[PDB]
Design a protein around this ligand. Structure first.
Ligand SMILES: Nc1ncnc2c1ncn2[C@@H]1O[C@H](COP(=O)(O)OP(=O)(O)OP(=O)(O)O)[C@@H](O)[C@H]1O
Ligand SMILES: Nc1ncnc2c1ncn2[C@@H]1O[C@H](COP(=O)(O)OP(=O)(O)OP(=O)(O)O)[C@@H](O)[C@H]1O
Ligand SMILES: [Mg+2]
Ligand SMILES: [Mg+2]
Lengths: 360, 360
């Protein structure tokens, strides 16, 4: 007579338990190697040999209980066998795992991915990009931030009238203007998590897409990159239905219903990005599916001035005006990425980038 | 000499027994983790650790009978082994499961889905949308409600003359007018259940479609979304037979016979939705397969007035007339979804949406 807690692979606290188990690797006869390397120079690579507990029956001595944990071997099922019937030690283990895991993810952003029909983490947590480091047009980031915050802070008003509690944003513009960078900065600012979804995958279907959109982690953003490339439309729409034009078992109607239909879930934010606004079917970007659409474009006077004052702090304000005037006189349109590269050429050299502005 | 009740996966009361078993999880040596999370803020996520009984041979103490329940492990078969030959405990268990399950589904709508050749539930029951929250044209929802109620309440008249006891409705219009929302509201009002069916699935055939249409749950609605996209027609029909145009092993004649043929079942309601009424073959929408067809269109004066008086309750009636007049003068055609979004911009701000009506 014992208690055999069974936690299979498909669990939210799976990573938390794995992290705690790696933390409590002491007193474990079976091990797995945990070496990592940091090269410095001269062929002297630092070693960091450690011990991940192997998928075995290691006996743990938590609170003097001789707890036995077994991880099997692609299907995985972790087991926490104990003595008697207490259930308190399980709660303590879960709480300690939560305390340890959330401590690790502090000041970072966790990136998930779509594996099969489920979300799994993708690498170590990434360092968040400061929001002010991304410079957009005057009064554009503030509007999006305010709209998202208002949507988050008013759930009652949605329920009191019956509208589904959902939202969606679309960003479009020329290549190299700040779409992905702004999305990353916003995710870092809002302390959310990014879920990456590809519509051209070879293992995605309508039912799997609906399940993925239904089981998305809480306090997270869903990102759809280049929705146009997954469905040719417009000129085709005048003659025949919208073909899928790719590899994967997906249909236009399935995606349309999944984004906003009858079985769509609640409390979800979806971001979409494209480079050809005119290649998107009108039914896809109608209100209800895309509440706010914004255009990010080429540089302007204020944007160039802010970029200059950001890359060379401490300089006099006249230099920024000189740089902006010269850039806008020498060329008409320019992308922020090109300006960033040109600045990267002249590292820590103010008044040097104000002279060699020949980039026609 | 015992009694071994066997209930495989393909049963209607399967969910009821699973819910009862989760209710009676006490005195079970083997367990499975039942933790859920509700984020609040500051990285403080509430834990709800519980215990779903694992697929094991847990010994239950219902009525002091030492009942043994075993769930195997994709094929599933639940077993209720008991002592002697009584069969009374089985009646009591089924009745308690029914009492518990129907208690949970109160005021909600259950959404089913097509898995293989059987209907299975899809997530938690969803909150029902009030019917008055969806505003359609004058005297349109009432007609459909009355027709459906008349069909439900008169089975004798159908039998006494020999007509098959079936019905079907079709809704068509511009994208973003209220088709799906009205269907959801009607399903909530009628205390029915929604079954989602996709005609472009990669595992659908004529025999499977017939089986699914024959085994649909009682007191339920069958929904076919975007029937046009599954069969190109019209201009093709003038030259060659109807092609399927997609992925899946289905034919036009198979669908036509399944909807209304010789083997079609009785007491079934089917809803169909499309955006291009002119792309549907005449044989598909003939009487007998689609009894009532209705058109949902753009906004009108009364619809706009009702929407305004719904989103801002307590306002004077003149404001609604002013808003309707200004909207209809500034623009001719406008979808209700755009009106909903424009109202969503001005939250709790009457007399503000009556001034900034520039949405051309
Ligand atoms: N507004 C901006 N301010 C600062 N850096 C920017 C800005 N826009 C782009 N960059 C820089 O350009 C590089 C890539 O930008 P990013 O990937 O966000 O562009 P994009 O417009 O989303 O491109 P693509 O459409 O090809 O995905 C990064 O080094 C990023 O810092
Ligand atoms: N008549 C209406 N009254 C109130 N809200 C409406 C109405 N029509 C649409 N909406 C709102 O529009 C949004 C989506 O509407 P819905 O999905 O029902 O439109 P649809 O015409 O069925 O669209 P699609 O053809 O793309 O499926 C929801 O927020 C819903 O509340
Ligand atoms: Mg990018
Ligand atoms: Mg709809």
């Amino acid at each position: 007579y014992m208690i055999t807690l069974e936690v299979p692979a498909r669990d939210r606290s799976y990573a938390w338990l794995l992290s705690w188990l790696t933390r409590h690797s002491t007193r474990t006869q079976h091990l797995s190697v945990e070496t990592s390397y940091l090269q410095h120079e001269s062929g002297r690579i630092s070693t960091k040999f450690e011990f991940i507990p192997s998928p075995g029956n290691h006996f743990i001595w938590y609170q003097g209980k001789w707890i036995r944990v077994e991880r099997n071997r692609p299907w995985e099922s972790v087991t926490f066998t104990a003595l008697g019937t207490d259930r308190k030690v399980f709660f303590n283990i879960l709480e300690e795992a939560r305390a340890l895991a959330l401590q690790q993810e502090e000041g970072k952003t966790v990136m998930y991915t779509a594996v099969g029909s489920e979300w799994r983490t993708f690498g170590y947590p990434r360092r968040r990009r400061p929001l002010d480091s991304v410079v957009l047009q005057q009064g554009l980031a503030d509007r999006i931030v305010k709209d998202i915050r208002e949507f988050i802070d008013n759930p009652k008003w949605y329920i009191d009238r019956g509208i589904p509690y959902r939202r969606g944003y679309l960003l479009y513009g020329p290549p190299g203007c700040g779409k992905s960078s702004f999305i990353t900065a916003l995710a870092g600012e809002l302390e959310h998590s990014i879920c990456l979804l590809s519509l051209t995958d070879s293992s995605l279907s309508d039912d799997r897409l609906n399940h993925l959109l239904s089981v998305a982690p809480q306090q997270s953003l869903v990102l759809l990159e280049d929705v146009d490339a997954a469905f040719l439309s417009r000129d085709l729409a005048v003659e025949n239905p919208i073909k899928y034009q790719g590899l994967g078992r997906l249909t236009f109607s399935g995606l349309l219903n999944a984004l906003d239909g009858v079985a769509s879930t609640e409390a979800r934010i979806v971001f979409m990005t494209t480079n050809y606004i005119d290649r998107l079917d009108p039914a896809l970007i109608r209100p209800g599916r895309v509440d706010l659409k914004e255009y990010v474009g080429y540089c302007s006077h204020w944007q160039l001035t802010q970029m200059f004052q950001r890359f060379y702090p401490g300089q006099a304000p006249s230099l920024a005006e000189n740089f902006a005037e010269h850039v806008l006189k020498a060329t008409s349109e320019i992308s922020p990425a090109q300006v960033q590269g040109y600045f990267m050429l002249y590292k820590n050299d103010p008044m040097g980038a104000v002279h060699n502005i020949e980039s026609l």
